[PDB]
Every structure is written in structure tokens, then in C-alpha cells.
Amino acid sequence: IRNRLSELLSERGLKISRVAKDVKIARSSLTSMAQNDSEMIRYDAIDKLCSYLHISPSEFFEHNPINFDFTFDEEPNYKINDVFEGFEVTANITHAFSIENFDFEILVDVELDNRQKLNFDLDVSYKETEKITNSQHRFIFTIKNEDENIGLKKYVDSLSAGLKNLLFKKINQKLSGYVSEIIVKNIDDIEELFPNKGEKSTTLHKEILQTDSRLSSDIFKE
Amino acid sequence: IRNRLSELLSERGLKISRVAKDVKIARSSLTSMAQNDSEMIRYDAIDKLCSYLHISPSEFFEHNPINFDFTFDEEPNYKINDVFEGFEVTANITHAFSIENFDFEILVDVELDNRQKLNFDLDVSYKETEKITNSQHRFIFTIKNEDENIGLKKYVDSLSAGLKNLLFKKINQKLSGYVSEIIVKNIDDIEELFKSTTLHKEILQTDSRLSSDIFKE
Amino acid sequence: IRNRLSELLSERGLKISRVAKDVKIARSSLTSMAQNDSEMIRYDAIDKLCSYLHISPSEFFEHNPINFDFTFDEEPNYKINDVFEGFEVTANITHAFSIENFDFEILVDVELDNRQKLNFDLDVSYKETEKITNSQHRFIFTIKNEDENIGLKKYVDSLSAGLKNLLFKKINQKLSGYVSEIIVKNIDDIEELFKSTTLHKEILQTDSRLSSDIFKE
Amino acid sequence: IRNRLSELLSERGLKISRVAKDVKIARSSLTSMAQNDSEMIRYDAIDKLCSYLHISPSEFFEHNPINFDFTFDEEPNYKINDVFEGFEVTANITHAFSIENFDFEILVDVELDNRQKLNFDLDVSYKETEKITNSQHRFIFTIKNEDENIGLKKYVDSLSAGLKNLLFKKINQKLSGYVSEIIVKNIDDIEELFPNKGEKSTTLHKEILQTDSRLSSDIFKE
Amino acid sequence: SDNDITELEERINQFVNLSQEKGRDATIDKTMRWLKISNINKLSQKQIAEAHQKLDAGLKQLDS
């Protein structure tokens, strides 16, 4: 499920600030709720927004009964070589360390409208530490058994594009958090000797937690 | 905005505990959210309920574009009479004191779907005290200018029964807090010698309800 | 899942001590495992028993694909009445106090062999206290909505007598722990002046059993 | 709304001091009220002035029912690089720092005679730190979506020239205050090592608050 | 001239004891605070008669 605020105001052409001025809702909370990322919503908010946009909650709440629940391995098969390439000197994840391999199993209990639930196992392995910017990098993972989970992809693409993007976000966020958690327990705190361009000094921990690892596979293209 | 989980469960006879077990949601939260009492709802909760009940969020969330807003006078016209006698026998606000007058105007905006909104002023004066219980008495306020609020009744009963009840609950709470704030300041606490309650606490617990043809429920 | 070692021994008249000597297994462990009381079984134990009794593990382990799970309300509806008088004469929970009300719903899932499972809600309220012994009294709870549990009785008696007894034991323990946890917190300890027992310990020892047409044993 | 004192005495040719001597009103208060800037006015003042000028309040109060209410972003997109070019030695805003960028949204809820209100969103970005004098500078902003708010301009120019100037003043003053507030919170107190030409030493704070940032766009020409 | 001083003590204790008999808790010192009497000895016949009025209302009404 997700609110369609982003799609609604894109269609209307209105801006979040403009809506906030109209419905007396805090800009930060409303803009966060505009994104599907927010997990909690207020009844006052749904009343004010549905009235302002003159629309029933039907158009506000995009719901598909297919629920995708994800579970990760308590213990993964992870090897992380430590390369002491002056991380403190240069705040680059590559300089701090490198993932030799990171493979594990992601169990997805896809549930249809009926309680009948189908479980799909994902052998996901670290592939490359993609460098998005000179400042930060994104870990990239890949599903070895993605061809086996072709039916899963059929179910994923069977949803709306907005809901597909919401799943991709959820998967990425869970995976990022998991990977950062494992690495931060495996790698000792490496603080930056020099604050970068007046930005307060940030430790490797802050960098890896900030690091967002998005899975890459034909199962999840967009 | 009206959660129909409660209605839906009455339709299907499903016990709240049964739903909570199936959707792995706390009974307490589910029962609080059942009558749309809580003003916050989790996306996970509604997703799970919709999938579990085989419904679109339309049957869960019932919304009428019409909006009602209630503004109370900053200064009301109130007079107090304090007996200070008979509160001791058993919790009873009426014996301790009563409000001789408490007439004040409430500016109510019934907003239509069109941006234009209609402003209606209702003057409610202290009518009597409802003896709902010997321990608690709820002040009753009657609308004097119900003529100006003839359209108010039409808008109010234009909404669903659940929505009407919601409105009645909100206005009742708001009125109760308003009158309690106004009165507790002019009322010295009386200890309930006959587990421990101060007449102040009585004032806090005592509520108030608008009895009028415009709001019969 | 029902160890039939006990039944098998009754069939063959073999004393538990005799089996333990022949299979070189501790008498204590063998007797604990005889009624399938212990929830852990050694592969060596079952291997030795099967070879010794000339049986396949089929006659040792009796399993019905059907599964029963029991979930108790997080908050039950209970009221307590504490006499605090007569507990001193001899251990007796009833004289010390009693539970005026203790009605709560238990969500029971009878899972079929098919992945689909059936959820049945039973509401059990405090009925009376069983005077099993003067020292120990077991609270009795009766199912109010036995109509919703008509199929529950059919599933329950669809199982073997041993399995039924197993279920009854499990539910009894669970109910006893639930009611003891709920009550001991609201009950001050009373020393048994007439080897040393505190009313708390009495609460711990006192159990509870669901007396209903659905569970007669 | 605005009093037309400036226009009235320009037409009469009289001076504020001359009017003050006539109506027994304090020169400072009267001269301030002569400007549309004053937000408060006394009934005694309107009586004395209307009588002195022998005119009804109609000619004194220029009122147009179109109300322009302005709201600014709680959190703007602002980047202000700090250049330590001896601000203390030369009291120039450029020497103290420089705005890398300052863009934000200004919501205008234009209201006609009827309660019907139209909201216009202004993507306003810092363009240049215009140096009015060697002593002080004026920050210049520009509306990126001014072409979208062409209808707003139609409403602005639909008013009287005096009322248009009053709006421009109000917009400039609000914008100046907002910008100075943001900068003074973002830039540390830089006091002037030397009082300038016998003028008591003034800190960067006093300079930026004194700095008046007037928005520049075709929406607001005059 | 004065015999109600002790009568007042009996009637405040009746109030306290009845209050305890009903439920919750009741204390004589808080009961005295109802009368707001600093000292039982220092009480005018007129004030003590007014005191009786306060107490009788608390005790007699719940009796009749």
C-alpha cells in the first residue's frame, strides 16, 4: 500500500509547500508523507488532503493485495578484507576496506489475496562497490538464482509502477541497513583525520551507514 | 474520514482478537483503531487489513469531502454558584457547585466540496446538568439561535451515521475541555473524605454535551 | 506426536526398569520420556528402543498432521476478591482470596493437513475453584461461546486418546501459568504460620483447568 | 491599503513639517505615516489630516480589495561560502562571505474581493550581490518560475502605482529580513577592527541586517 | 454558655467515621480543614453553629 500524494500533486501540478499552506500541515511531515517512504499517517492528514484535492481515499491510497514480506539470513556468508588505504585521510569506502564476497539468502513470502503464500529464496552476492560520487559509494548486489525466481519477477511486474518503486525502495533500504550493520560490526571505527571541506569529521561508521546498497537484478529493474 | 473496520467486523462477525492474530497486529492497537478513535494509522496496518479482508482501502476509509471546524469564544459569558455542600457525601459536582450561566458563541464552518465554505454561528447557553452517574454530571448547553443553524442540521445529518457520531464525540470533548478549563480556575478543590479525589479532579472528569435539535445524538 | 513407549510397555507388560537395563538407558530419563513428558528425545534412545522392541519408529512416534496452537489475550478481563482470612489454618488459596471474574478469549488455530488452517475463538470465564486438595485448588474456566467451537470439539476428539490427553495437559499448564502470572501480582504474600509456604508460592502451585463440553478430559 | 499622504502633499505642494505645524502632530510620526511604511494610524491623526486638507477619508485611504499575503519557506535551499577577506578590516559584505546559492519558495495567496483566493509559488534564487555603495551592498534575487506567475504579474499591475510600490516595499522588506535572518544564523559575528570614519564600529551582523535585498523580476518592475 | 465544642468533635468524628464506613479514607484534621478552624477552643458560638451546618449537610443528607 502507499499514498499517491506524489502522483496526485504531479497530476495537479501543485507543490508540497503550496498544499501545506492550504491544509495547515507541517511542511516536513507533509513532504515526507508525499514520498511513499513514510510508514505512518494521520487521520487528520487524510481528511485534509482528500478534501483539499476533492478526492475520495480511493485515489489517495493505492493498495494491491499482493504483500511482499522479506526476511534475511541471521548469519550471512560474508568476507570483508581490510585495506588500510588512509581512510582517515580520504573518506572513501574503498580506502577503508573492500568486500571480498557477501552472499546470503533473502526469503520473500509473497502473499496473494488469498492466505496462500509463496516463498522465493534469493541467493544474493556482492558484485561491485559502485562509486556514485567521489565522496560516497553504493554497494551493488546481484541475485544468482534470479532465473529461478522468474515467477517472483512476474509477480513484481504485475503491480503498479508506483508500488513497484515502493518495493524497490523497501528492498534497497532493508539491504542497505543489513549490509551496513554487518560491516560496522566487522570493521573497527576509522575516524577521518581531517573534516572534509568544513563538514564536521565523519567516521567510517557514518559513511557505511550513509552508504546505500541497492540490489541489481532483472527481477528489480526500475 | 471513518474507519469501517468496526462496521466490517460487525458485518463478518469477526472478533477483534481473531483479526489481530491473523494480521499479526496488537489487539490493543487494533481495538483502539476499530472505532477510528486513534488519530494515527500505520500504512502496514491498513495494508494488512485490506489484504486480509479482501477489500480496497475504500471500504476501510469512508470520507465525505465536507469538513467541519469549531472555534469557541476566547472569553465566554459565564457565572458560577458554589454550594460547597454535599460534595463530601459521594463524588457529585452538582452539590459542590454549579454554573449559573455559561452562554457563549461557537463559530462553526461547514466547508463544502467547493472551496467556498459556510460560516454558521451557534450560541450555546448552560441548560442543565446531566446526571449520567452520581459520581459524574455532564453540563448540558442548548443552542439559542437554532434558526441560524437550520442549514447546520441539514449538513450534519447529510453525513453518515458514523461520521455524525464522530462529530458528536469531537464537539463533546471540545465543549467538555472548554467548560472544565473555564470552571476549574474559579473552583477551589474539595477533598472527597467519604481512591482519593479532589473537586478539581471531579471538574476534569465531568464533561459537557450540546443538547439541541441540530445535534440530537 | 505421541511416544507409545508407555503404551507399548503396557502391551508387553515390560517394567520401565527392565527396559532401561536392557537398553542401557537411565531409568529416570526412560520414565520421563515414557509418557512423552520430556520435549527432547535422543536418536540413540529411539534407535535402542526400536531395536529392543522389534518395532519401526512408527509404533514409537504417533503423529497426526493436525496441529493446535493456543494464544491468550494480552490483557484479560479479571476482577479479584481477597478475603485474607482462613489461609493461615492450612494451605488454602480459596480462603486467602478468589478471582471474582477472569473472562478472556483464547485464539485457537486447528491447522488442517492442507496449508489452510481454521481459527476458532473460545471465551473462557472463571466458573469456580476445584478443591482437588485442601492444600491446592485449581481454578475452573468455562467456555461461553461453545457454539463457535463445535468444530473445535470434532477436531479435538478426532485425535487419539493419548494426543487428546497431551493437549489437555498443555492447555492446562498454559492456563495455570497465565492465571498465576495475572493473580500473583495483585496478591500480597500470606505466610502459612500453621515446610515454609507464602501465599505467592500457593498461587504458583495452584493450577487451572478448562471444564467444557469441548474438553471433558 | 495605504494612506495617500505622500500623493496628497505632493499634489498640494506642502511639506510634512508645514503640515505638522498645522495639525499639531509630531514631525517624526507624521513623516513616517506620510510614507506608506507605517502599519498603524491614529483616529486623531486621520481627523486632523482630513480636516486640514479639507478632504474625506476616501481621498486619504487608497484601498484595493485584492490582498497579497506572502509566506516563505521554513527551510530554504541556501549555500553560503565563507571567504575570510578581512571583513573586520573592510566592512564589505563581499569581504565577509558570498552566497553560493539561495533558492526557496515564496507562496503568495492573492485574494480577490470574493473569498476566492489564488496561490502563486515563486522559485526565487539568489542572483548577484549588487554593490549599491562602496559601504553597503544589496542582495538581488530572481524568480525562476516568474513566467508561470504571469497571472500574478497581471494582478500586480492591475493595482494602482502607489499600491504597487507599497507591495514592492513589503516584498523587499520581508525578503531582506528573511535573508538577513538566515545569514546571521549561518555566519559567525565578524566585528570591524576599525570604526569606519569615526562611525562607531559595526559588526557584520549589523551590516547584513542593514543590507536590504530587493527581489528583481518582470513581475515586480517598479 | 458553651457545650457545642465537644458536640462539634462528636459530629466531625461521625463525619470521619461515616466517610471511612462509606469507603476511601477520612481524617479528622482534613475534616477540621473543611471548617477551616485553627483551634477547636478558639471557636465562636456563631462560627461553630455555622460549622454544624457544614457537617450536618455532609452527614445527615447521606443518613436521610
PDB file of C-alpha atoms in Angstrom, chain D residues 57-144:
ATOM      1  CA  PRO D  57     -11.034  59.714   4.063  1.00  0.00           C
ATOM      2  CA  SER D  58     -11.885  58.418   0.545  1.00  0.00           C
ATOM      3  CA  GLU D  59      -9.014  60.543  -0.856  1.00  0.00           C
ATOM      4  CA  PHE D  60      -6.910  59.754   2.268  1.00  0.00           C
ATOM      5  CA  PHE D  61      -7.196  55.929   2.159  1.00  0.00           C
ATOM      6  CA  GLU D  62      -6.371  54.215  -1.124  1.00  0.00           C
ATOM      7  CA  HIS D  63      -7.811  50.712  -0.749  1.00  0.00           C
ATOM      8  CA  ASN D  64      -7.863  47.885  -3.314  1.00  0.00           C
ATOM      9  CA  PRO D  65      -9.712  44.680  -2.208  1.00  0.00           C
ATOM     10  CA  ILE D  66      -7.013  42.455  -3.776  1.00  0.00           C
ATOM     11  CA  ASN D  67      -4.995  41.261  -0.738  1.00  0.00           C
ATOM     12  CA  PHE D  68      -1.488  39.825  -1.385  1.00  0.00           C
ATOM     13  CA  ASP D  69      -0.337  37.619   1.530  1.00  0.00           C
ATOM     14  CA  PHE D  70       3.212  36.258   1.360  1.00  0.00           C
ATOM     15  CA  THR D  71       4.681  33.199   3.099  1.00  0.00           C
ATOM     16  CA  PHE D  72       8.311  31.970   2.926  1.00  0.00           C
ATOM     17  CA  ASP D  73       9.961  28.543   3.206  1.00  0.00           C
ATOM     18  CA  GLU D  74      10.655  27.460   6.813  1.00  0.00           C
ATOM     19  CA  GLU D  75      13.836  25.762   5.493  1.00  0.00           C
ATOM     20  CA  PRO D  76      15.366  27.244   2.277  1.00  0.00           C
ATOM     21  CA  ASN D  77      17.911  25.737  -0.135  1.00  0.00           C
ATOM     22  CA  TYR D  78      20.775  28.057   0.894  1.00  0.00           C
ATOM     23  CA  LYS D  79      24.557  27.647   0.488  1.00  0.00           C
ATOM     24  CA  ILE D  80      26.777  30.497   1.820  1.00  0.00           C
ATOM     25  CA  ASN D  81      30.553  30.010   1.308  1.00  0.00           C
ATOM     26  CA  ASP D  82      32.637  31.903   3.917  1.00  0.00           C
ATOM     27  CA  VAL D  83      35.512  33.935   2.374  1.00  0.00           C
ATOM     28  CA  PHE D  84      37.687  35.460   5.145  1.00  0.00           C
ATOM     29  CA  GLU D  85      38.729  38.529   3.082  1.00  0.00           C
ATOM     30  CA  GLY D  86      39.383  40.819   6.091  1.00  0.00           C
ATOM     31  CA  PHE D  87      35.754  41.795   6.726  1.00  0.00           C
ATOM     32  CA  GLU D  88      36.983  43.273  10.031  1.00  0.00           C
ATOM     33  CA  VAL D  89      39.471  45.404   8.017  1.00  0.00           C
ATOM     34  CA  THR D  90      36.956  46.450   5.282  1.00  0.00           C
ATOM     35  CA  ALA D  91      33.231  46.491   6.159  1.00  0.00           C
ATOM     36  CA  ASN D  92      32.087  44.990   2.807  1.00  0.00           C
ATOM     37  CA  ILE D  93      29.603  42.048   2.704  1.00  0.00           C
ATOM     38  CA  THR D  94      31.656  40.577  -0.195  1.00  0.00           C
ATOM     39  CA  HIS D  95      34.774  40.630   2.088  1.00  0.00           C
ATOM     40  CA  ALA D  96      32.828  38.820   4.866  1.00  0.00           C
ATOM     41  CA  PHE D  97      31.334  35.992   2.711  1.00  0.00           C
ATOM     42  CA  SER D  98      29.482  35.180  -0.517  1.00  0.00           C
ATOM     43  CA  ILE D  99      26.198  33.459  -1.336  1.00  0.00           C
ATOM     44  CA  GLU D 100      26.909  30.369  -3.420  1.00  0.00           C
ATOM     45  CA  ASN D 101      23.166  29.959  -3.958  1.00  0.00           C
ATOM     46  CA  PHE D 102      19.961  30.916  -2.153  1.00  0.00           C
ATOM     47  CA  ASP D 103      16.812  29.463  -3.713  1.00  0.00           C
ATOM     48  CA  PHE D 104      13.467  28.912  -1.949  1.00  0.00           C
ATOM     49  CA  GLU D 105       9.724  29.105  -2.453  1.00  0.00           C
ATOM     50  CA  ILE D 106       7.584  32.219  -1.807  1.00  0.00           C
ATOM     51  CA  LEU D 107       3.847  31.341  -1.659  1.00  0.00           C
ATOM     52  CA  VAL D 108       1.507  34.282  -2.477  1.00  0.00           C
ATOM     53  CA  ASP D 109      -2.192  33.757  -1.575  1.00  0.00           C
ATOM     54  CA  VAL D 110      -3.686  36.518  -3.726  1.00  0.00           C
ATOM     55  CA  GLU D 111      -7.267  37.193  -2.661  1.00  0.00           C
ATOM     56  CA  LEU D 112      -9.874  38.947  -4.775  1.00  0.00           C
ATOM     57  CA  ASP D 113     -12.899  40.786  -3.419  1.00  0.00           C
ATOM     58  CA  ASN D 114     -14.604  37.392  -3.074  1.00  0.00           C
ATOM     59  CA  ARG D 115     -13.081  34.935  -0.536  1.00  0.00           C
ATOM     60  CA  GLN D 116     -11.854  33.025  -3.650  1.00  0.00           C
ATOM     61  CA  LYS D 117      -8.036  33.062  -3.120  1.00  0.00           C
ATOM     62  CA  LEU D 118      -5.395  32.107  -5.758  1.00  0.00           C
ATOM     63  CA  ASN D 119      -1.945  30.878  -4.569  1.00  0.00           C
ATOM     64  CA  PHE D 120       1.201  31.554  -6.682  1.00  0.00           C
ATOM     65  CA  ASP D 121       4.517  29.734  -5.965  1.00  0.00           C
ATOM     66  CA  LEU D 122       7.771  31.679  -6.608  1.00  0.00           C
ATOM     67  CA  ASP D 123      11.025  29.723  -7.113  1.00  0.00           C
ATOM     68  CA  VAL D 124      13.292  32.622  -6.025  1.00  0.00           C
ATOM     69  CA  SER D 125      17.079  32.201  -6.314  1.00  0.00           C
ATOM     70  CA  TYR D 126      19.936  34.475  -5.344  1.00  0.00           C
ATOM     71  CA  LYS D 127      21.468  36.007  -8.469  1.00  0.00           C
ATOM     72  CA  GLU D 128      24.043  38.647  -7.535  1.00  0.00           C
ATOM     73  CA  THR D 129      25.288  40.633  -4.506  1.00  0.00           C
ATOM     74  CA  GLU D 130      24.714  44.046  -6.119  1.00  0.00           C
ATOM     75  CA  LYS D 131      27.014  46.689  -4.596  1.00  0.00           C
ATOM     76  CA  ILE D 132      24.921  49.857  -4.203  1.00  0.00           C
ATOM     77  CA  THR D 133      27.733  51.784  -2.491  1.00  0.00           C
ATOM     78  CA  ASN D 134      31.335  51.142  -1.553  1.00  0.00           C
ATOM     79  CA  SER D 135      29.978  50.930   2.012  1.00  0.00           C
ATOM     80  CA  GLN D 136      26.950  48.590   1.654  1.00  0.00           C
ATOM     81  CA  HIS D 137      25.554  46.071  -0.891  1.00  0.00           C
ATOM     82  CA  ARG D 138      22.017  44.908  -1.837  1.00  0.00           C
ATOM     83  CA  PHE D 139      21.410  41.161  -2.443  1.00  0.00           C
ATOM     84  CA  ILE D 140      19.459  40.634  -5.719  1.00  0.00           C
ATOM     85  CA  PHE D 141      17.096  37.644  -6.152  1.00  0.00           C
ATOM     86  CA  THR D 142      15.218  36.425  -9.240  1.00  0.00           C
ATOM     87  CA  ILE D 143      12.050  34.342  -9.762  1.00  0.00           C
ATOM     88  CA  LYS D 144      12.814  31.238 -11.919  1.00  0.00           C
TER      89      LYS D 144
END
